[PDB]
Amino acid sequence: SVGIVYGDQYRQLCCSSPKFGDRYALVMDLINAYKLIPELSRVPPLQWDSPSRMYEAVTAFHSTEYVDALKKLQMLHCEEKELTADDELLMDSFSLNYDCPGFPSVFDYSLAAVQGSLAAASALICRHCEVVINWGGGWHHAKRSEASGFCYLNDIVLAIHRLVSSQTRVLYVDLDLHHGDGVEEAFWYSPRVVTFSVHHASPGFFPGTGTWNMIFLNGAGRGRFSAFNLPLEEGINDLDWSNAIGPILDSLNIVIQPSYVVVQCGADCLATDPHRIFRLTNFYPSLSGYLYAIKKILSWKVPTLILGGGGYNFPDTARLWTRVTALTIEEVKGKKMTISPEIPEHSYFSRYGPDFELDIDYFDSIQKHHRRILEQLRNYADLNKLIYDYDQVYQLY
Ligand SMILES: O=C(CCCCCCC(=O)Nc1ccccc1)NO
Ligand SMILES: [K+]
Ligand SMILES: [K+]
Ligand SMILES: [Zn+2]
């Protein structure tokens, strides 16, 4: 069974931010226009018995002082009066400024993604769903006491923490254009949560990590060799990104044998994203790199959490996430999900113009990374006393 996080209030909150606007409504209404909703189990966002219970849940990762500053930021932004000099200093000390500004629903908006991803982790734990999708989540940059790249609360870390605390090993796969720094850092010292981020990295490109350090860092203490990274040069197409990631994913699965897989599916790798870095598509016959990776992960038959993330071309993010959703139903249930290449009529139909089609409107260094990663995987397996066939893994690359 495939679950999807949705709710009336959830949709209102996920649509309340200045950066992501109505993106979540476009994604959910396109999935609905394509008649996918009757094939999915609605997973309600988690709600708490009291403010103390909510604080206990969020503070499993975030500091109380940061959560307090985030809630104060919402309160201050619900008042006409400008912030005092003292409050400006307090907010800057948590990086609650710049690409992480305040807005009237900043706390409710941030908390909603945590509510959705924690409920999605619970549905996997109780075996109600084999896979759960949360297009309102995937806020990979948020740190313990710091907002970063429009991520205020780290719903991923919190969902993984719920999964690990459920012998349990979690594999985290981050497909976003940006390095999954917040998640990687949270589990830097933990061998039980293996993190893998594929992303662009170049001088001055956000956040600056997931690449050669001035050496390639990969975790510390008992978590040494547990944080995997594949930085890629700009312009990579569906096929080359699929071949660069494919052997890594299969190798991680074979060696780690994860109990759960958590996938961040940021849509900013799309050729049509305004970042204009990678040339990935949502094409499903070249085959979308996203659809290739998700199909591979799903073939493992491991309980999986699929989350959103980046994606600044709202109708193109909806086009991709609708295809990921339909593919998830197909792979899990074995039921063919035929999707018309024409966008069906609905509320947001006008946003898919002027052509109104489902396909997005688009027409060696890796070998050295593969050898380095294989060696890191062997090192991780030896440190963690894991049994694996080296020849079976080496042959994958
Ligand atoms: O996508 C991110 C965050 C990256 C840094 C935050 C800036 C996001 C942004 O505003 N991107 C953009 C939007 C419109 C046009 C061009 C770039 N993390 O995964
Ligand atoms: K990534
Ligand atoms: K780790
Ligand atoms: Zn991104």
Residue 150: name the closest of 138, 158, 168, 160 by CA. 138
Q: For residue 178, which atom of ligand 1 is closest to its CA?
A: 19
**CATH number of domain containing 275:** 3.40.800.20
Neighbours of 234 (CB within 10 A): 13
**Three-state DSSP class for residue 82:** coil
Q: For residue 180, which atom of ligand 1 is closest to its CA?
A: 19
Alpha helices, DSSP H only, in 153-278? Answer: 155-164, 181-186, 238-256
Resolution (A): 2.0
Query: Is there a cis peptide before residue 207, judged by omega within 30 degrees of 0?
Result: yes
The residues, any chain, with a CB within 8 Å of residue 86's CB and separated by 6 or more, are none
- Cα separation, 181 vs 151, in Å, equals 11
Dihedral sign (CA 182, 188, 193, 196):
positive
140, 141, 179, 369: which one is catalytic? 141
CA–chain centroid gap for 48, Å, is 24
CA–chain centroid gap for 5, Å, is 14
Residue 176: name the closest of 143, 147, 145, 151 by CA. 151
Ligand nearest to the CA of 223: 3
Are 117 and 155 spatial neighbours (Cβ–Cβ below 8 Å)? yes
- CA dihedral defined by 297, 158, 51, 10, rounded to 10 degrees? -30
- What angle separates helix 64-77 from helix 51-58, to the nearest 10 degrees? 120
**Number of domains composing the chain:** 1
- Ligand 1 centre to CA of 149 (Å) is 7
Backbone angles phi, psi at 280, to 5 degrees: -80, 155
Residue type, 301: K
- Cα separation, 80 vs 235, in Å, equals 45
| Smallest CA separation from ligand 1 atom 10, residue | 19
Q: Dig out the tokens for 51 from the structure.
A: 């403010």
- Cα separation, 78 vs 192, in Å, equals 41
128 is catalytic: no
Residue 133: name the closest of 284, 321, 7 by CA. 321
- Ligand 4 centre to CA of 194 (Å) is 20
Counting runs of H as helices and runs of E as strands, what totals does the chain give?
13, 8
Residue 393: name the closest of 370, 369, 366 by CA. 370
- Cα separation, 395 vs 197, in Å, equals 22
Which residues, chain by chain, have CB under 5 Å from ion ligand 4? Answer: 176-178, 266, 268, 310
- C-beta of 219 in contact with ligand 1 (< 6 A): no
The residues, any chain, with a CB within 8 Å of residue 379's CB and separated by 6 or more, are 224, 225
First to last CA, the chain: 33
Q: Which of 140, 268, 273 has the most ligand 1 atoms within 8 A of CB, as the residue to mutate? A: 268
- Cα separation, 310 vs 207, in Å, equals 13
- Cα separation, 22 vs 36, in Å, equals 20
Query: Is there a cis peptide before residue 38, judged by omega within 30 degrees of 0?
Result: no
Residue type, 220: A
Neighbours of 372 (CB within 10 A): 15
Residue 355: name the closest of 311, 316, 324 by CA. 316
- What angle separates helix 51-58 from helix 106-125, to the nearest 10 degrees? 80
- Reported as type and span, the H/E element at residue 199 is strand 193-200
Q: Dig out the tokens for 183 from the structure.
A: 């998640």
- C-beta of 23 in contact with ligand 1 (< 6 A): no
- C-beta of 62 in contact with ligand 1 (< 6 A): no
CA–chain centroid gap for 290, Å, is 12
CA atoms within 13 A on the CB side of 374: 18
- Cα separation, 150 vs 95, in Å, equals 10
Are 199 and 221 spatial neighbours (Cβ–Cβ below 8 Å)? no
Are 262 and 171 spatial neighbours (Cβ–Cβ below 8 Å)? yes
Dihedral sign (CA 315, 320, 324, 326):
positive
Ligand nearest to the CA of 268: 4
Across the beta sheet with 2-5, the strand order is 41-43, 2-5, 131-134, 304-307, 260-264, 170-174, 193-200, 227-232
- Cα separation, 337 vs 335, in Å, equals 6
Print the domain residue range for 282: 1-397
- C-beta of 323 in contact with ligand 1 (< 6 A): no
- Cα separation, 216 vs 263, in Å, equals 23
- Cα separation, 132 vs 40, in Å, equals 9
- Cα separation, 32 vs 25, in Å, equals 10
Cα radius of gyration (the chain): 20
Backbone angles phi, psi at 108, to 5 degrees: -55, -45
- Cα separation, 177 vs 155, in Å, equals 18
- Ligand 4 centre to CA of 187 (Å) is 20
| Binding-site entries | 176, 178, 268
DSSP secondary structure string, 291-354? HHHHHHHHHT---EEEE----SSHHHHHHHHHHHHHHHHHHHH-------SBPPPSTTGGGGTT
